[PDB]
Design an enzyme around this catalytic site. Structure first.
Site, PDB file in Angstrom:
ATOM      1  N   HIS A   1       0.858  -1.163   0.000  1.00  0.00           N
ATOM      2  CA  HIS A   1       0.000   0.000   0.000  1.00  0.00           C
ATOM      3  C   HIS A   1       0.900   1.220   0.000  1.00  0.00           C
ATOM      4  O   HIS A   1       2.091   1.122   0.330  1.00  0.00           O
ATOM      5  CB  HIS A   1      -0.856  -0.013   1.273  1.00  0.00           C
ATOM      6  CG  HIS A   1      -0.049   0.004   2.530  1.00  0.00           C
ATOM      7  ND1 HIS A   1       0.317   1.173   3.168  1.00  0.00           N
ATOM      8  CD2 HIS A   1       0.489  -1.005   3.257  1.00  0.00           C
ATOM      9  CE1 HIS A   1       1.031   0.881   4.238  1.00  0.00           C
ATOM     10  NE2 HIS A   1       1.150  -0.435   4.317  1.00  0.00           N
TER      11      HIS A   1
ATOM     12  N   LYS B   1      -7.362   4.940  -4.708  1.00  0.00           N
ATOM     13  CA  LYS B   1      -7.024   5.318  -3.341  1.00  0.00           C
ATOM     14  C   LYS B   1      -6.102   4.311  -2.647  1.00  0.00           C
ATOM     15  O   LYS B   1      -6.311   3.097  -2.750  1.00  0.00           O
ATOM     16  CB  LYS B   1      -8.306   5.512  -2.527  1.00  0.00           C
ATOM     17  CG  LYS B   1      -8.096   6.178  -1.181  1.00  0.00           C
ATOM     18  CD  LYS B   1      -9.371   6.147  -0.347  1.00  0.00           C
ATOM     19  CE  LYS B   1      -9.182   6.902   0.952  1.00  0.00           C
ATOM     20  NZ  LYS B   1      -8.668   8.282   0.701  1.00  0.00           N
TER      21      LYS B   1
ATOM     22  N   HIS C   1      13.009  -0.381   6.482  1.00  0.00           N
ATOM     23  CA  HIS C   1      11.793   0.427   6.427  1.00  0.00           C
ATOM     24  C   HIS C   1      11.754   1.572   7.435  1.00  0.00           C
ATOM     25  O   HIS C   1      11.378   2.701   7.092  1.00  0.00           O
ATOM     26  CB  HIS C   1      10.562  -0.440   6.562  1.00  0.00           C
ATOM     27  CG  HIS C   1       9.282   0.301   6.357  1.00  0.00           C
ATOM     28  ND1 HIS C   1       8.952   0.889   5.151  1.00  0.00           N
ATOM     29  CD2 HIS C   1       8.246   0.553   7.193  1.00  0.00           C
ATOM     30  CE1 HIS C   1       7.771   1.471   5.259  1.00  0.00           C
ATOM     31  NE2 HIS C   1       7.312   1.267   6.483  1.00  0.00           N
TER      32      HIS C   1
ATOM     33  N   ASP D   1       4.649   2.877  13.987  1.00  0.00           N
ATOM     34  CA  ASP D   1       4.214   2.435  12.683  1.00  0.00           C
ATOM     35  C   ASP D   1       3.111   1.407  12.820  1.00  0.00           C
ATOM     36  O   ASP D   1       2.742   1.020  13.934  1.00  0.00           O
ATOM     37  CB  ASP D   1       5.425   1.763  12.035  1.00  0.00           C
ATOM     38  CG  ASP D   1       5.404   1.837  10.533  1.00  0.00           C
ATOM     39  OD1 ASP D   1       4.503   2.515   9.974  1.00  0.00           O
ATOM     40  OD2 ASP D   1       6.313   1.231   9.934  1.00  0.00           O
TER      41      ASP D   1
ATOM     42  N   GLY E   1       0.042   0.804  15.831  1.00  0.00           N
ATOM     43  CA  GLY E   1      -0.565   1.153  14.556  1.00  0.00           C
ATOM     44  C   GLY E   1      -1.709   0.218  14.220  1.00  0.00           C
ATOM     45  O   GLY E   1      -2.788   0.667  13.819  1.00  0.00           O
TER      46      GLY E   1
ATOM     47  N   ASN F   1      -1.051  10.897  13.660  1.00  0.00           N
ATOM     48  CA  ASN F   1      -1.999  11.223  14.728  1.00  0.00           C
ATOM     49  C   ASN F   1      -1.756  12.628  15.259  1.00  0.00           C
ATOM     50  O   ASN F   1      -0.986  12.837  16.208  1.00  0.00           O
ATOM     51  CB  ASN F   1      -1.999  10.210  15.860  1.00  0.00           C
ATOM     52  CG  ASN F   1      -3.244  10.336  16.731  1.00  0.00           C
ATOM     53  OD1 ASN F   1      -3.403  11.308  17.463  1.00  0.00           O
ATOM     54  ND2 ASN F   1      -4.143   9.371  16.628  1.00  0.00           N
TER      55      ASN F   1
ATOM     56  N   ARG G   1      -2.829  15.741   3.549  1.00  0.00           N
ATOM     57  CA  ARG G   1      -3.452  17.040   3.792  1.00  0.00           C
ATOM     58  C   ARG G   1      -3.375  17.966   2.598  1.00  0.00           C
ATOM     59  O   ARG G   1      -2.352  18.002   1.888  1.00  0.00           O
ATOM     60  CB  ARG G   1      -2.770  17.739   4.979  1.00  0.00           C
ATOM     61  CG  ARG G   1      -2.864  16.978   6.278  1.00  0.00           C
ATOM     62  CD  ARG G   1      -4.200  17.213   6.980  1.00  0.00           C
ATOM     63  NE  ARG G   1      -5.276  16.374   6.462  1.00  0.00           N
ATOM     64  CZ  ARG G   1      -5.397  15.077   6.731  1.00  0.00           C
ATOM     65  NH1 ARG G   1      -4.499  14.479   7.506  1.00  0.00           N
ATOM     66  NH2 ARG G   1      -6.408  14.374   6.224  1.00  0.00           N
TER      67      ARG G   1
HETATM   68  N1  LIG Z   1      -8.648  19.422  15.579  1.00  0.00           N
HETATM   69  C1  LIG Z   1      -8.844  18.019  15.264  1.00  0.00           C
HETATM   70  N2  LIG Z   1      -8.854  17.084  16.256  1.00  0.00           N
HETATM   71  C2  LIG Z   1      -9.038  15.772  15.968  1.00  0.00           C
HETATM   72  N3  LIG Z   1      -9.211  15.343  14.703  1.00  0.00           N
HETATM   73  C3  LIG Z   1      -9.205  16.239  13.663  1.00  0.00           C
HETATM   74  C4  LIG Z   1      -9.019  17.612  13.930  1.00  0.00           C
HETATM   75  N4  LIG Z   1      -9.054  18.281  12.736  1.00  0.00           N
HETATM   76  C5  LIG Z   1      -9.261  17.377  11.760  1.00  0.00           C
HETATM   77  N5  LIG Z   1      -9.353  16.132  12.313  1.00  0.00           N
HETATM   78  C6  LIG Z   1      -9.583  14.824  11.622  1.00  0.00           C
HETATM   79  O1  LIG Z   1      -8.460  14.180  10.941  1.00  0.00           O
HETATM   80  C7  LIG Z   1      -9.063  13.162  10.204  1.00  0.00           C
HETATM   81  C8  LIG Z   1      -8.477  13.027   8.835  1.00  0.00           C
HETATM   82  O2  LIG Z   1      -8.180  11.729   8.480  1.00  0.00           O
HETATM   83  P1  LIG Z   1      -8.466  11.220   7.023  1.00  0.00           P
HETATM   84  O3  LIG Z   1      -8.385   9.682   7.082  1.00  0.00           O
HETATM   85  O4  LIG Z   1      -7.352  11.768   6.083  1.00  0.00           O
HETATM   86  C9  LIG Z   1     -10.137  11.717   6.410  1.00  0.00           C
HETATM   87  P2  LIG Z   1     -10.174  13.152   5.270  1.00  0.00           P
HETATM   88  O5  LIG Z   1      -9.158  12.740   4.196  1.00  0.00           O
HETATM   89  O6  LIG Z   1      -9.723  14.478   5.977  1.00  0.00           O
HETATM   90  O7  LIG Z   1     -11.592  13.284   4.670  1.00  0.00           O
HETATM   91  P3  LIG Z   1     -12.036  13.545   3.185  1.00  0.00           P
HETATM   92  O8  LIG Z   1     -11.914  12.300   2.378  1.00  0.00           O
HETATM   93  O9  LIG Z   1     -13.533  13.920   3.287  1.00  0.00           O
HETATM   94  O10 LIG Z   1     -11.316  14.680   2.507  1.00  0.00           O
HETATM   95  C10 LIG Z   1     -10.490  13.477  10.084  1.00  0.00           C
HETATM   96  O11 LIG Z   1     -11.234  12.671  11.015  1.00  0.00           O
HETATM   97  C11 LIG Z   1     -10.583  14.822  10.535  1.00  0.00           C
HETATM   98  O12 LIG Z   1     -11.858  14.992  11.000  1.00  0.00           O
HETATM   99 FE   LIG Z   2       5.676   2.240   7.860  1.00  0.00          FE
HETATM  100 MN   LIG Z   3      -9.008  15.161   3.166  1.00  0.00          MN
END
Ligand SMILES: Nc1ncnc2c1ncn2[C@@H]1O[C@H](COP(=O)(O)CP(=O)(O)OP(=O)(O)O)[C@@H](O)[C@H]1O
Ligand SMILES: [Fe+2]
Ligand SMILES: [Mn+2]
Ligand SMILES: [K+]
Length: 567
Positions: free
Chosen positions: A15, A40, A115, A138, A169, A315, A419
Site C-alpha cells: 500500500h 485510493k 523500512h 508504525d 498502529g 496522529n 493534507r
Molecule cells: N482538531 C482536530 N482534532 C481531531 N481530529 C481532527 C481535527 N481536525 C481534523 N481532524 C480529523 O483528521 C481526520 C483526517 O483523516 P483522514 O483519514 O485523512 C479523512 P479526510 O481525508 O480528511 O476526509 P475527506 O476524504 O472527506 O477529505 C479526520 O477525522 C478529521 O476529521
Molecule cells: Fe511504515
Molecule cells: Mn481530506
C-alpha cells in the site's frame, strides 16, 4: 549532480506507492501513485505513474539516475517470510520501473533501505535540525512496529525496537475497523475521539510505564507464518479482547442494493458514533503509550528535539500533546510520516551515503505536478463551461469565502501527503457557524461529527493559537486562544483543538495574498481548508480531476490556475 529516485510500492501485498526524486539533496519531484491513478491508497503496485512524473518533471530518464532506492528491505522480507528472494537487481528494477514506461541503456545501482530507517530519514534529514531523538511508530516495518533512534552528525543510530505483534498502529486500525469506521480510515477514529469519554485507558490490555507500554494480551514474538506482517494475528487478538471488555460487539458491514443509487452500497449495521467512548479510550491509550516511548528516547539521547515518523505519526492530536510536553522543546513531523514517505526517506538515506547534503523541506509539501494556464484552459475548453480570468483572483476568492461560499482552489504543485495545503484545497469561511455542517453534510458527504481545520497567516498565528510556532503541514493539533475559539467556530473541534496550517509569503504567495485579502474583510486572515475531493476520494490532482469533482459536488466556485469558474 547526485540524482536519487526513491520508491515505495510493490505488486504483492503493498500500500502507499509513491516516488520521490532528489537532485543534490533537493526534492525535484515527489508524488503519490493514488493521485495519478485515482486509485485510493496505491495498493499492490509499483509506483509507475509517480516515478514517470518524477522523471518528466526533472527532464530525466533512468540513465540519469545515480541510484534507485526502495523504502523497505524487500529481499529480507522474502527470505524471512517467503522462503527466498528470487530476483537479481535487474529483475527487481524491471518490476519497480517497467521498461515500457522506463526505457534504459543499463541498470542504475539499486538500494534497499530498511523500512524504519527510511521513515527516520524522511523526518531527520528534512527537519532543518542537526540532531535529535527519533521515534518511529508504525503499523509494521519488516519486523518491528516501533523504532527508537538517535539522529546526530547525519547518522541515524537505532537504540531499541518493539516487535510487530505489539503494534500501536495495528491496534488503532483494529479499533477503527471494530467501530465500523474501517481499518483504512483511522483518521476518522481520531476525529471521533473528542466526542467520547474515557473511563479506563488501559482497555484492560495495555500496562503503561515511564518508557512506553506493555501488551501482555499478545505474545510479543507472535508471527503469522502465512503472511509477512502480523496484522491478521493482532486483528484476531484485538477483536476477541474488544468484544469481551466493551459493551458493543464489532460493528458489521452491510452490503445492500440501494435503488436510489442503482448500486450495492456498503454501510454499517450500527452508527459508528455509538462507539465514541471506545474511540476516546483508544486515543487516550495510544497517547499514553506514545508519551512513554517519546520520553524514553529523549532521555536516553539527551535531546530535546523529537522526530516522529511512521503511520501513527499521522496522529495529529497525539503530536499536538507531545509538543506541549515538558520533555519536548522542538518537534519535527514530516507531511509524509506514513508509508508514502519512505520513498523520499529511502532516497535521502542513499543520497547521504553518496555524500549529498539534504535540504530542509521548508514549510511546503508542494512537490507534485502543476499545470500551466494553457494546460488548464484545454481542460476547461473540453468541458464547455464558461469561465473568467479575473484581474485579481485572490481578492475575488477572498470575497467569495467571506460571503459564505465554498471555493475550489487548485494552484501550483500538488501537495504530497494526506493534507491539502492550499494547492488542492476546498476553501470556506472559518467564521461561519453553519459552514461545518454545510461542507460535511451537503458538500463532501461526511459524518456530522467530523471537524475541519484552518489555514492562516503565520503572522497572526501567535494571537490565534496557544502555541507560537510554524505549523506548515496540518500534522499537529493545538488549542485556540480564548478570543478566537468562538470567532472561528467552523474550524474548532469538540475540545477547542484545531489542526492548523500556517502560511508564509515565501511558501505560497498566492494563498498568502488571498488570506491577506480575506483578513481585510472578516477581521482574521483565516479560512477553512479541507481537501478538494468528495469524501473518500483521492485529493484532486489534474485540472480535469478538479473539474469532475467541482461538477459532481455543490461547490460554488473553482479557482483553477488563473481562471475562475462559477456554478
Ligand atoms: N482538531 C482536530 N482534532 C481531531 N481530529 C481532527 C481535527 N481536525 C481534523 N481532524 C480529523 O483528521 C481526520 C483526517 O483523516 P483522514 O483519514 O485523512 C479523512 P479526510 O481525508 O480528511 O476526509 P475527506 O476524504 O472527506 O477529505 C479526520 O477525522 C478529521 O476529521
Ligand atoms: Fe511504515
Ligand atoms: Mn481530506
Ligand atoms: K513546551
Amino acid at each position: 549532480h547526485m540524482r536519487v529516485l526513491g520508491l515505495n510500492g510493490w505488486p504483492r501485498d503493498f500500500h502507499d506507492a509513491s516516488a520521490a526524486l532528489l537532485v543534490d539533496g533537493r526534492i525535484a519531484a515527489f508524488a503519490e501513485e493514488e493521485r495519478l491513478t485515482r486509485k485510493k491508497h496505491g495498493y499492490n503496485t509499483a509506483p509507475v505513474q509517480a516515478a514517470a512524473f518524477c522523471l518528466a518533471q526533472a527532464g530525466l530518464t533512468v540513465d540519469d539516475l545515480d541510484a534507485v532506492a526502495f523504502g523497505w528491505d524487500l529481499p529480507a522480507m522474502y527470505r524471512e517470510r517467503l522462503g527466498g528472494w528470487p530476483h537479481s537487481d535487474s529483475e527487481a528494477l524491471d518490476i519497480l520501473l517497467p521498461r515500457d514506461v522506463f526505457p534504459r541503456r543499463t541498470d542504475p545501482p539499486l538500494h534497499f533501505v530498511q523500512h524504519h530507517l527510511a521513515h527516520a530519514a524522511s523526518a531527520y534529514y528534512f527537519s532543518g535540525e542537526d540532531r535529535g531523538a527519533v521515534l518511529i511508530v508504525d503499523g509494521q516495518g519488516e519486523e518491528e512496529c516501533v523504532t527508537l533512534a538517535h539522529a546526530e552528525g547525519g547518522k541515524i543510530t537505532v537504540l531499541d525496537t518493539v516487535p510487530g505483534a505489539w503494534s500501536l498502529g495495528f491496534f488503532y486500525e483494529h479499533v477503527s475497523e471494530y467501530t465500523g469506521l474501517g481499518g483504512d480510515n483511522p483518521g476518522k477514529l481520531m476525529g471521533l475521539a473528542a466526542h467520547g469519554t474515557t473511563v479506563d485507558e488501559t482497555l484492560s490490555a495495555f500496562a503503561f510505564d515511564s518508557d512506553g507500554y506493555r501488551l501482555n494480551l499478545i505474545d510479543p514474538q507472535a508471527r503469522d507464518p502465512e503472511d509477512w506482517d502480523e496484522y491478521s494475528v493482532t486483528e484476531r487478538a484485538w477483536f476477541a479482547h474488544l468484544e469481551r471488555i466493551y459493551r458493543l460487539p464489532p460493528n458489521e458491514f452491510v452490503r445492500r442494493y440501494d435503488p436510489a443509487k442503482g448500486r450495492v452500497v456498503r454501510d454499517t449495521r450500527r452508527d459508528p458514533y455509538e462507539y465514541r467512548d471506545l474511540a476516546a479510550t483508544a486515543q487516550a491509550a495510544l497517547e499514553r503509550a506514545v508519551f512513554g516511548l517519546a520520553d524514553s528516547v529523549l532521555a536516553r539521547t539527551g535531546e530535546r528535539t523529537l522526530f516522529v515518523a511512521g503511520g501513527v505519526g499521522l496522529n495529529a492530536t497525539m503530536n499536538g500533546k507531545l509538543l506541549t510536553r515538558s520533555t519536548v522543546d522542538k518537534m519535527f513531523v514530516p507531511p509524509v510520516a506514513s508509508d508514502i514517505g519512505v520513498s523520499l526517506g529511502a532516497a535521502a538515506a542513499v543520497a547521504v551515503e553518496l555524500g549529498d547534503r539534504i535540504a530542509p523541506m521548508g514549510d511546503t509539501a508542494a512537490w507534485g505536478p502543476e499545470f500551466s494556464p494553457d494546460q488548464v484552459r484545454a481542460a476547461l475548453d473540453r468541458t464547455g463551461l464558461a469561465y473568467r480570468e479575473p484581474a485579481n483572483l485572490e481578492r475575488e476568492v477572498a470575497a467569495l469565502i467571506a460571503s459564505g461560499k465554498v471555493v475550489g482552489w487548485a494552484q501550483g504543485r500538488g501537495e504530497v501527503g494526506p493534507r491539502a495545503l492550499g494547492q488542492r484545497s476546498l476553501l470556506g469561511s472559518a467564521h461561519s457557524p453553519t459552514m461545518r455542517d454545510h461542507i460535511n453534510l451537503r458538500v463532501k458527504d461526511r459524518e456530522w461529527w467530523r471537524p475541519f481545520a484552518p489555514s492562516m497567516l503565520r503572522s497572526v498565528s501567535d494571537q490565534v493559537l496557544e502555541v507560537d510556532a510554524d505549523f506548515p503541514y496540518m500534522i499537529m493539533t493545538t488549542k485556540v486562544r480564548a478570543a478566537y475559539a468562538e470567532r472561528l467556530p467552523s474550524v474548532v473541534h469538540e475540545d477547542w483543538s484545531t489542526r492548523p496550517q500556517t502560511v508564509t509569503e515565501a511558501s505560497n504567495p498566492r494563498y498568502h495574498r488571498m488570506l491577506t485579502e480575506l483578513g481585510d474583510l472578516v477581521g482574521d486572515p483565516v479560512c477553512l481548508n479541507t481537501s478538494f475531493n468528495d469524501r473518500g476520494e483521492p485529493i484532486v490532482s489534474s485540472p480535469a480531476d478538479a473539474l469532475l469533482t467541482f461538477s459532481r459536488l455543490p461547490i460554488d466556485a473553482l479557482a483553477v490556475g488563473p481562471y475562475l469558474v462559477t456554478k
